[PDB]
Amino acid sequence: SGMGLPVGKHYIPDKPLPMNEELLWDNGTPFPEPCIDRIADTVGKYEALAWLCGGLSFFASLGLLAVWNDKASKIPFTPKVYPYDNLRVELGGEP
C-alpha cells in the first residue's frame, strides 16, 4: 500500500536469443525469472524427489501400521441396533 520505486529498464537483447526464450517469464523489470521456478535451489531435482518419496513412504508406512493395528478388532461396544427392524421402512425398505 503506497507508491514504490520505478522498476527500471528491462533487458534489450544484444545477443541471439535462445530457441526457448518463451520459457522466460520476463516482466518489464530487469529481474526476470523462468515461468517454472524451483523454490529450493540448494537441493537438486532428484534429491528433492527422493525426499518427497521418503515423506510419502512415511505416510504409507503409518497407514500400514494402522492396518496392522486392527483397531476395529478391539472395539469396546457392540454395533447399535435400531428398533422396528433396524429402521427398514424409515431408511427405505419395502413396507
Binding site: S1, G2, M3, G4, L5, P6, V7, N27, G28, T29, F31
Partner: peptide
Amino acid sequence: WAPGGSKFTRNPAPP
C-alpha cells in the same frame, strides 16, 4: 522492496 522481496514492484512509479 529489494529485488525478490515481498513488496518488489508492488506499486511502481510510472515510467
